[PDB]
Write a protein that binds this ligand. Structure first.
Ligand SMILES: *[C@@H]1O[C@H](CO)[C@@H](O)[C@H](O)[C@H]1NC(C)=O
Lengths: 101, 51
């Protein structure tokens, strides 16, 4: 269980490092998933060894640019059918309609 | 050698990962030192294995 006081998984992540649990399922929200990923990066928990799965259905929203070259074989799940052209067009319509982000 | 005309050592670090070189002795000004360390962190080449 991630600490409920704040999204600072420093002790829990260090415990995983001590336990050497490589394959690590998650069950989070993409907002908290981003923080967990960033804190994992600061511990070197994001290399060619670890292998995650995010139950979050918003994995594609993650800014994976700082992690794309890391070599982690991350996984996830996407239900938003963004591959379709109509869905994609509605996506840009949403992006332009959202004046404040 | 860190490529000249730029500071993006990305291919060098990737080759190091292919080369499995776990020990490194950099030699550069502190600005280039910070740059190369950040780029190494990008590839995740910065864990307790390396030195
Ligand atoms: C790539 O993913 C496989 C599982 O499909 C995993 O066993 C392997 O360690 C991964 N390679 C990495 C993370 O470099």
């Amino acid at each position: 269980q991630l600490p409920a006081d704040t999204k600072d998984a420093k002790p829990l992540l260090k415990e995983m490092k001590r336990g050497k649990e490589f394959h690590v399922i998650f069950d989070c929200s993409h907002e908290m998933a981003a923080g967990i990923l960033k804190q994992a990066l600061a511990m070197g928990m994001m290399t060619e060894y670890y292998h995650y799965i995010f139950t979050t259905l918003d994995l594609f929203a993650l800014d994976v640019e700082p992690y794309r070259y890391s070599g982690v074989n991350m996984t996830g799940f996407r239900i938003l059918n963004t591959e379709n052209t109509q869905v994609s067009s509605i996506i840009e319509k949403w992006s332009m309609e959202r004046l404040q982000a």
